[PDB]
Each structure stands twice: as C-alpha cells, then as structure tokens.
Design a protein around this ligand. Structure first.
Ligand SMILES: Cc1cc2nc3c(=O)[nH]c(=O)nc-3n(C[C@H](O)[C@H](O)[C@H](O)COP(=O)(O)O)c2cc1C
Ligand SMILES: Cc1cc2nc3c(=O)[nH]c(=O)nc-3n(C[C@H](O)[C@H](O)[C@H](O)COP(=O)(O)O)c2cc1C
Ligand SMILES: N[C@@H](Cc1ccc(O)c(I)c1)C(=O)O
Ligand SMILES: N[C@@H](Cc1ccc(O)c(I)c1)C(=O)O
Lengths: 222, 221
C-alpha cells in the first residue's frame, strides 16, 4: 500500500549513550506534578514544540488518534474552571467514594482549581475513540487510549525538557460538558487536562518518593 | 499524612527554552518503530537508565502501578517468541478480523517475530490493575492503564534519547501465557512488549508520514 524505506539512525559511542541516558533520567526525575502555576507568559513557540513532540508518538496501526485542544482565552479558561470545580465538588462529596477520597488526602487536593485560571495555557488532550477517513467512512483506532497516553507521556517529557511544569489531571464527569463547551465532536473524549506554565514562586509539592529500581524492575532467567 | 515542601525548579532563559523544545521535538521526530533489530550487545546501565526514566512518570494518586520485566536470557526470549507467534498466527488468521488485517497491510507485519530472538533485551511492561499494601490489603490503582502508558511513553523517549530503537507491540491473547511463563502475579497484565537494541544494518520502516500541526492542534477562542 505504501513504500518501505531504509531506516536512518543516529547512534552515539557507548560512553555518550551512558551519559545521555543518565542525564535524561536525572532530568525526568526532577519532574513533579505542580498545582501552583504562575500567570506568567510562555512562548507559544515552546507550546507548539511540546505539542509537536507529543504528536511523534507511536499509535496503533498508525492512526494518530489525538487532538490537543489549546486554551489561552481567559473567558474560556474560567468557563473550563467552573465546569471542573462544579463536577469535582460532587466528586469529592459523593462520586469518588470514601476510599478514593482518603487516598487523595496525602495530596491536599480539593475541588477548587485556581490553576485553571492562573496558568497561561491549558492543554486538553482528547482521544479519538474512532476516526473518519476522507470519504467519511469510520476508521478503527486500535488501542487509542494507550496510544494517546503514550503521546501525553511524550508531552510531559517535553514540558520538563523545556523547563515548564504541569499537573496531569482527570476531571471525572467533566468530559461531556468540556467536549460541548470546546466544540469537539462526539467521538472525541477528554483524556487528561494539562495546565501549563511556570511554577508559582510559592509552589509546593507533596514530599512523595518514587520506588527503588529493584521495586519496579525484575530480571528473568531460567 | 505526608509533608508538603517547596518545589524546586530548573528554568532556562526563553531563547534556550525555544532551542531545547525544538531540538527535543527533532529528536523525538526521528523515533520510528523498528522491526529489524540487531543482536549486538547494549550496556545494561543504559537499559537501567531508561527503566528509571519510565519510573519517574506521574501516576493516579501516586500508585506507581508498573512492573518492567527485563528478559535477556536466550531460552526465555525464544519461549516468549513461540508463545507470541502462536497467538499472533491465530490473530491474523481469525481473531483480529478482516478489517484489522487489512488495516495492517501497510506495515507488512505478520505472525513471525524474529526480533524477539535477535534483540538482546526484551522489556515487557506490566500494569498492576490493583496493588497491595504492606499489610496485604488491596489498594486501588486509579487510571492504572493510562498511568502505565504514560510511563511507557517516557520509556520510548528515553530509548530514542540514548540512540536505541524498539517497536511498541501488543501481543493480543498472549498476555495470560506470558504472565505465567514469566512468573508474574494474577493482578499484573502485560500492556506492551518492547524489544530493544540497535537497528539491523538492513532495517526498513514503512514510509509513513505524521500529521501536520494544524491536524492535531486546535486553538479555542
Ligand atoms: C498501542 C500500540 C500498539 C501497537 N502494537 C503494535 C503491534 O502489535 N505490532 C507492531 O508491529 N507495531 C505495533 N505498534 C506500533 C505501530 O504500528 C506504529 O507506532 C505505527 O505504525 C506508526 O509508526 P511509528 O512508530 O514508526 O511512527 C503499536 C503502537 C501502539 C501505540
Ligand atoms: C492518570 C493520572 C491521573 C491523574 N489525575 C490527577 C488529578 O485528577 N488531579 C491531580 O491533582 N493530580 C492528578 N494526577 C497526578 C498525580 O497525583 C501525581 O502524578 C502523583 O501524585 C505523583 O506525583 P508526581 O507527578 O509529582 O510524581 C494524575 C496522574 C495520572 C497518571
Ligand atoms: N500485534 C500484531 C498486529 C499489529 C501490528 C501493528 C499494529 O500497529 C497493531 I494495533 C497490531 C503484530 O505484532 O503483528
Ligand atoms: N481529579 C481530582 C481528584 C484527583 C486528584 C489527584 C489524583 O492523583 C487523582 I487519580 C484524582 C482532583 O483534581 O482533585
């Protein structure tokens, strides 16, 4: 159907591979989810580059099932805020349940989300649960959720790389209202919302620790 | 429950932010899924650094619901190969269906997977659909699949950054046999399998193109 071509690869000497892999780990390790974000301007060129980076993700059968909806308009951001705070309040009060609520205590999150106003840019990542071809026939988006999550991962990496912060959020039950507000089609579903900017001078994060290597990696012999 | 501490941030001057974001895009853009992988040795230090990088992912309510199972043993890799080829053959013949099969023609994939033997290292990413606390009580892993996929994304980025290649694979219906072979617990499920190494001198990729920016980005006023 399409042509297959020689793959062109950039290879480093081993020592540099070692250093690169270490530095990249050290860089990503400094990524923390930040819930206090400055209103300070960020260059749209950088925002575009991080979205381009996300778009380089692999996807099931090459379907690229993602839409990155960018919101900079203050009225639109605030509209987004109110929807989310409204739904999250019901979430904390009742819909998540006691266990989940208890599970969140360590993070000190609640239903008020100031960052949705203060962050200069919001990125809403929509997955396309199926697509359409040019003739208007439906196309299957194999593993679209995983594919879009991988893209989101790349996006997260690209933000850290560029010196920006965010917090990956899942505004449970806000999806349908957000879809309508933002004029997205019925086959798109909000996956995560990323408020983007610099951290506030007064930003804090929970003193969480990541697992040791021997807690996430298992090597298997015979 | 735990303490909240000042967040420490590394910030660049804007111009450098621009250049960094561009270079990182250009680096990731050169990532392609590679299905022809050399048996040449790769430093385990690098493999560990890419797994460490994956492990830095955010996760729902801080649950880190992932297990990276590393396989270098040739017997064990071959065992993995046979399970997958066996299941994939049924997949192409019958289980995926005509539409999916047609959808894969452009990639020229079939049920034979030489890379599972030739790649010096296989990484099987397992999601923990729920976890256990130290007392043995069950813990909920909120959005574990998304959380693990995001980790996989970071892993993919880390591989490209270190000059390694792979192909993200989903060996449909091979999950249960693979979990048993590899001694993983019942609450772990194989998400993707990544064969890792250098590309074969003769590696090819389909001449696919990515969407234009204006095809993935929408700005809303
Ligand atoms: C969720 C997911 C599942 C995939 N499963 C397979 C697979 O089973 N076999 C395979 O050969 N490639 C698989 N791929 C790789 C895609 O076919 C590949 O990303 C796509 O063709 C675009 O190519 P690229 O990664 O070089 O940009 C998968 C990718 C994703 C995101
Ligand atoms: C799928 C997913 C959903 C998340 N949803 C939220 C959310 O709705 N609200 C929030 O404040 N943080 C959310 N987070 C962020 C996590 O709480 C955070 O990643 C975790 O506490 C560990 O913190 P760290 O990112 O700084 O390592 C989410 C993370 C993931 C992976
Ligand atoms: N897992 C099979 C088929 C396959 C292949 C590529 C792809 O993007 C998808 I979604 C499925 C295989 O490995 O051939
Ligand atoms: N979405 C809610 C609750 C929440 C918060 C953090 C988190 O890791 C998870 I999973 C859920 C909120 O944003 O507060």
């Amino acid at each position: 159907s399409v042509e297959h071509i020689p793959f062109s690869h950039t290879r480093y000497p081993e020592q540099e591979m070692r250093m690169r892999s270490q530095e990249f780990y050290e860089l990503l390790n400094k990524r923390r989810s930040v819930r206090f974000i400055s209103s300070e301007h960020v260059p749209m060129e950088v925002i575009e580059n991080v979205i381009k980076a996300a778009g380089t993700a692999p996807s099931g059968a090459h379907t690229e099932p993602w839409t990155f909806v960018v919101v900079k308009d203050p009225d639109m951001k605030h509209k987004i805020r109110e929807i989310i705070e409204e739904e999250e309040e019901i979430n904390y009060m009742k819909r998540m349940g006691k266990r989940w609520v208890t599970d969140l205590k360590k993070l000190r999150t609640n239903w008020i989300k100031e960052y949705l106003d203060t962050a200069p840019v919001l990125i809403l990542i929509f997955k396309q649960v199926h697509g359409f071809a040019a003739n208007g026939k439906k196309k299957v988006h194999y593993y679209n959720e995983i594919s879009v999550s991988i893209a989101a991962g790349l996006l997260l990496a690209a933000l850290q790389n560029a010196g920006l912060v965010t917090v990956t959020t899942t505004p449970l039950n806000a999806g349908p209202r957000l879809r309508v507000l933002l004029g997205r089609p019925s086959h798109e579903k909000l996956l995560v919302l990323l408020p983007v900017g610099y951290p506030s001078r007064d930003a804090t994060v929970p003193d969480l620790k990541r697992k040791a290597l021997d807690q996430i990696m298992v090597t298997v012999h015979h």
